[PDB]
Design a protein. Structure first.
Length: 137
């Protein structure tokens, strides 16, 4: 519930000249276990890194570099049910497009067990990482 295993990949909370801050409210945040999963999103190799964290909040700020394969890879990590991380947060996802976004996650977000980060993340997004992923918002 009050899980302390947040793992972030690819881009993320660093601040890629967002012009806000550094985005130090996702790193430690609640002083929980801060671990990096790595680039790409490769859920299979990150299953071995799930032994490490065993992240409840599996986030990858992968701009479709994960692909719809590895997107459906984390659906299989949930549908694994062996390893937790039923709640994912799909950072980036596509590019600039929220209001009337693609048919990609129109159907994949139909289930949308995960949330999505805007094309210009803020910690308002990770306010929701730690919110909905504790259990509910």
């Amino acid at each position: 519930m009050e899980k302390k295993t947040i793992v972030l990949g690819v881009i993320g909370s660093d601040c890629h000249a967002v012009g806000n801050k550094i985005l130090d409210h996702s790193f430690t945040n609640a002083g929980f276990n801060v671990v990096n999963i790595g680039v790409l999103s490769s859920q299979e190799d990150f299953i071995n890194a799930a032994i490490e964290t065993k992240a409840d909040l599996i986030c990858v700020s992968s701009l479709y570099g994960q692909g719809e394969i590895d997107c459906k890879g984390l659906r299989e990590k949930c549908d694994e049910a062996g390893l937790k991380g039923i709640k994912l947060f799909v950072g980036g996802n596509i590019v600039v497009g929220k209001q009337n976004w693609p048919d990609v996650e129109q159907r994949f977000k139909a289930m949308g067990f995960d949330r999505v980060y805007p094309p210009g993340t803020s910690p308002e997004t990770t306010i929701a990482d730690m919110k909905e992923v504790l259990g509910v918002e």
